[PDB]
Symmetry: C3
Subunit: 552 residues, 3 copies
């Protein structure tokens, strides 16, 4: 006969949603800097879990929603304490500059409440909305964009925009499983799964249509989607080599300080030096053409018996139709229709992209939270690596794939595709003959083999309160496990054997085959439908009986 033995520290887990504690490398004050969390562990302590085939589904990860919330929080914290520009949203009299930039004189307010001052600032034509009628050769009345929705907050000049890497290290009681399988798409079993303390750093790079400064495949071009048949889903295309992109603003501007109230200062653009050249961005022609030909071929493999054509964005307003790019705080909206202009036939010198620049943006597709970026003095040149594309298939011989974007969460999927967060369930039950490494690096081994890591495992056991909630819940779960072990007469031990027999039914396997060829994951899956009745049978009856008999 066999009796029930309770094992604490079993390398078994279940899928779970939980808040993660971010981390960054040591050393700041810039936008997206992580002053809200701990320094990183210089050695992630990655360990491979052998004979483990975890089913990953990147489209359902809670890490993407967590990252979105954390990025929004950091963004708002960065803008919150500075100038709200409520003295603006006044009538402007805009004249041609000596059609993208207008002179736009206005009065606003002065530092004293009793006076006004006639001032001027240059604005882009995309920020000013006409009033009355626009006279090509004369001054016309304008208002700033979003003055009918919300006054914009001025970016605070003391900080800059820099996508510092953010490391989400699993919180205690949870572990992050990293998929290291190559040519792995967004959904399906991963045959090379490791457990890490922390993820690789994720850069919160903001862009549309093209994925910049991300990770690249070591294999081939990877097409990721929830389903390719369903035309409403976004397709993330990962390249195995990057394409260099260099974006410039080939002009010079002078920053002017207009005092609009006590303390608060408005930073205006003016005194243009030289001619006004159009902003532009260069992508090498040969690399782009080879990249799109290979993407076409891979999609053709995914879409057989079809011609694949890249045309243009479907249409809409500027923020969706164009390629949003952040160059040192200067927000570019590039016209990419000249890049996605090709057809892939299954049977068979740089490109200059014209760009427009806006000072007033509505980031994250929110309404009423607009921000005004001050002009940045300097060369304003940014070089980045194009590592992937966002394509949307239109809803017949030829399939149409258009540039997409507008929902920033998909860009973070391009980096979080290899991670899953799981909850450790260290308490397991198994029959034994008697009657009475690190992290998860034992999973996949036999039940008998996983006898040493039982003690090593479980040694782990706005933003401020979420961090406390995570720590307090980890404490509460640990204490619940210790209380349950105490109730069973097992506290103080990691392995305890009790008096309840194992009379088959729960599992029809013998002692030797269970400890021999079964893993703890398989065992828990088989016993998952019995666990609560087993616990209830072990609970109270045996410990009350033993304590009462010992007392009397």
């Amino acid at each position: 006969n066999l009796w029930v033995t309770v094992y604490y520290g079993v390398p078994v887990w279940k899928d779970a949603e939980t808040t993660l504690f971010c981390a960054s490398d040591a050393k700041k004050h810039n936008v997206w800097a992580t002053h809200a969390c701990v320094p990183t562990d210089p050695n992630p302590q990655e360990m491979v879990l052998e004979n483990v085939t975890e089913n990953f589904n990147m489209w359902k990860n809670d890490m993407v929603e967590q990252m979105h919330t954390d990025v929004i929080s950091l963004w708002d914290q960065s803008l919150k304490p500075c100038v709200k520009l409520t003295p603006l949203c006044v009538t402007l009299e805009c004249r041609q500059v000596n059609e993208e930039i207008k002179n736009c004189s206005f009065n606003a307010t002065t530092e004293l409440r009793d006076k006004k001052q006639k001032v001027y600032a240059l604005f882009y034509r995309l920020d000013i909305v006409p009033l009355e009628e626009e006279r090509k050769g004369n001054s016309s009345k304008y208002r700033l964009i979003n003055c009918n929705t919300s006054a914009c907050t001025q970016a605070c000049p003391k900080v800059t925009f820099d996508p510092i890497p953010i490391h989400y290290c699993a919180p205690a009681g949870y572990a992050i499983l990293k998929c290291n399988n190559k040519t792995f798409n967004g959904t399906g079993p991963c045959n090379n799964v490791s457990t890490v303390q922390c993820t690789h750093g994720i850069k919160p790079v903001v862009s549309t249509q093209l994925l910049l400064n991300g990770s690249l495949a070591e294999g081939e071009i990877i097409i990721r989607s929830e389903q390719l048949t369903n035309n409403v889903k976004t397709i993330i295309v990962h390249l195995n080599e990057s394409v260099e992109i260099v974006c410039t603003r080939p002009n010079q501007y002078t920053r002017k300080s207009i005092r609009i109230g006590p303390g608060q200062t408005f930073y205006a653009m003016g005194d243009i030096i030289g001619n006004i050249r159009q902003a532009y961005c260069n992508i090498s022609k040969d690399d782009w053409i080879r990249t799109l030909q290979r993407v076409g071929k891979k999609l053709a493999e995914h879409f057989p018996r079809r011609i694949i054509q890249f045309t243009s964005p479907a249409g809409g307003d500027l923020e969706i139709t164009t390629h949003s790019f952040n160059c040192r705080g200067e927000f570019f909206y590039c016209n990419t229709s000249s890049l996605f202009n090709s057809t892939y036939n299954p049977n068979d010198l740089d490109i200059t992209i014209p760009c427009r620049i806006k000072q007033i943006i509505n980031m994250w597709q929110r309404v009423g939270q607009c921000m005004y970026a001050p002009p940045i003095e300097g060369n304003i040149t940014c070089k980045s690596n194009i590592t992937g594309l966002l394509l949307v298939r239109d809803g017949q011989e030829t399939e149409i794939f258009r540039p997409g974007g507008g929902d920033m969460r998909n860009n973070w999927r391009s980096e979080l595709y290899k991670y899953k967060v799981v909850e450790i369930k260290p308490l397991g039950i198994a029959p034994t003959r008697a009657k009475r490494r690190g992290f998860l690096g034992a999973a996949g081994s036999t039940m008998g083999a996983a006898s040493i890591t039982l003690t090593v495992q479980a040694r782990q056991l706005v933003w401020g309160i979420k961090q406390l909630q995570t720590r307090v819940l980890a404490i509460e779960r640990y204490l619940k496990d210790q209380q349950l072990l105490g109730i069973w007469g097992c506290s103080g031990k990691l392995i305890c054997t009790t008096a309840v027999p194992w009379n088959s039914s729960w599992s029809n396997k013998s002692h030797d085959e269970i400890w021999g060829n079964m893993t703890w994951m398989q065992w828990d899956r088989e016993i998952g439908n019995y666990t609560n009745t087993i616990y209830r049978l072990l609970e109270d009856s045996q410990n009350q009986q033993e304590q009462n008999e010992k007392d009397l």
Copy 2:
């Protein structure tokens, strides 16, 4: 001889004040919605405690203060993020409408800071305060009420006013005792006491004088007060049957949108269609008369040899003198003097109540936190159940009972009268012969009988931080108990016997009569004056002696 035995999980408790974790049924965004707390348990798991006579005192409950704070918090969270109406509080030129409503033209501000716009809105005469002199036949200057105190926040049109039930489920380590005794007044022993996880849902209905949509007695009319002799206390009268009340605003208004600044929009009343009819509310005459005759009789039983007369409110301003009623966000102030117009003689067709409506209110009797309710388009008809009355006895043959109100906490007492919050003290001490169900559903049983639930009991062991404080304190108390048991050499067990003898004095009862006829509540009360000396005698000396002797 007998020796001291320590029992953990004893069904004993003491009165305590603590923060509760609210709950609501699944599914919103409206005012008083509970987005701040957990879904409810579909089965409260009510269990009756036999042979338990808990002394209830509803007037000292901390649940009333907790509810008041939670309601204020939800109210402020609902109004906080929308329009502050600071462009108002301007001079208005008010003319007769083509005397309760005036045309009141004003300029306010426009969405651009440099312009003003002549606009008009209809206001009730109760909201506008005259300036200069009021000319019956001409335009006169007015200001809006509270412009000398605080600008009012506009109710945000995205939410409505709906008294969703709120379930306060006792937090871990505490339990709620529900009194199920009929014809039970606010203070005194309850002979049918049950323990619940959660209370019945409490609706945060706002009203004065009359208690609407509340609970009703299953017995007779119940008169509740701290003392009837003391004339400063409010008397809550509970009926055993409800009276239907139907309140209407028999007019139609058009909502106008006046843009006063970026984003923020003021919602004005205007374009009255048809004639202006006075708002009114109907109460059936026969039910009201029978209700007051029976209330009179019951008070006469409480006030013998007296004639009981219902006259009018004593006097004061509108907010206290009238009956405040919230109909889909439209705030009614009904004149109830025609209802409380009767005399009860110990020896022996609907009523129409005229009502006035205000848009600007000072809810909860606060100063500087006024709110402006926008006009609501529609039929505006509300039917409710009158379940109780608030009466105040005046300070001689005839006693005068006047309608009262003005302190919202008393309305919540009308629902919380049956609940008490107690703290569980699971650690108990009792002598034994040796030398070395659920919740609280064992209380009242003998000490020997309550030997099984020792293991079942203790398995339980702005708004965000209060919730963390409650959870952390529950954890800290649990750990203090476990540390104390460890110090005594008892951890890992629920029942432990130690070497300290019981040499009478602490209790003069024998082993058999203690385990036979005594309950744990009685035992703890008898030992309450000794517990700390007993603990000190058990603590340290015996465990240090045993560990030192075992070591050497």
Copy 3:
């Protein structure tokens, strides 16, 4: 042979930084009142640690930074909810009063947005900044100070300024060591060290140059600095007797209420009664002279072969050059150059100090957080005890010591100099023969003697969240210790002996000399370089071996 024995509750500690839980005596609403923390323990339970020589360094204490943060938090909480005075910062037309006070007429705003009102208020010449050109005999234009930086918040009239004592009681798991050695400077070993639950009360008195209402030495004058050679450090001079200082404002003013917006009211000074007398403060001449002669002598002992001369502040603006003094909310800036006017020769009737008063201050040397103090009606007389001085030595026969100040943290050092915060490390390891009071009041005793307090010790195991972080971390550390003891097979006990031998190397001392002449502090210091290898040898191997052998 000897084997490793684990002792929990060892009176050993390490230096640590941690948040403290403040406390105050029972009973308010005033500025610096502590509504944010617990009532004090009426008996601090001070216990002297014999044969303990703790090395104190007041200049590196984290309690000073903690106090600074707590004082700033209380200050901001006190000013935050009242009037922001944004209607001010208007042009003023200032005429001579019928040169320190000017009539300064201005319009500001009225309670209604559509009207302005011509009003006047008297202001000090130090608060108004001239515009255009100042005409001695005519009205000139002025603006209020800080209107180019930030509008000032009006002190809320409902609260006053009172330096209530604040008791920082060590949080659980930490203890405060108080140095009771007399003639003890800021840095060095203290030979009379006691452990307390709480510190003496610290009064947050705000002043510069002179330390008021502080503690005084019971020995001699004490000179405290990080280094006297380095001329950039501040020198805190503690006297063994106080000097009485009486400061007055010998005038009368009428408070005027100017309504500037809804609710918010500006409190103006006006209607001066009688002549305008200069504010002044008296220090007795004989006590001051004796005090400075003795300070000179003590510094001469510290600076031998030098003449010590007290001259004047080096120079700078008013806020640094003068002596800042807070008299019932009226902020005085006294000219102390007449006091520090003497030379100490190593070989051998009250003083009236003229003072100026400001209404607008920039407290704590912050920029953009100015506060406007309303005039206070009354006698305005304050008497205080001068207990110490802040001197700065200039960078040659004669040394120059000038009054200093400007960094409030140094004043709190004058009170916190005797306290150090340490973390308790209750888990210790020692060899034994076998193979298998209160607070810290055992430190300094032998290892064998400290066998009783092992159980007594460890019984301890914006502002809201910091308090939760402290409590949660204390819980987490306790649980980590209990988990580690459980892993070793020791939980439930305070002293446990395991099977790992002690084969010298770790310590070359015998059992008897270790338990005989060694203390736990010395033992831990000697074993500090081995502790982690010892724990790893005890951990897992022995408990896994025992559980596996017992199971099979």
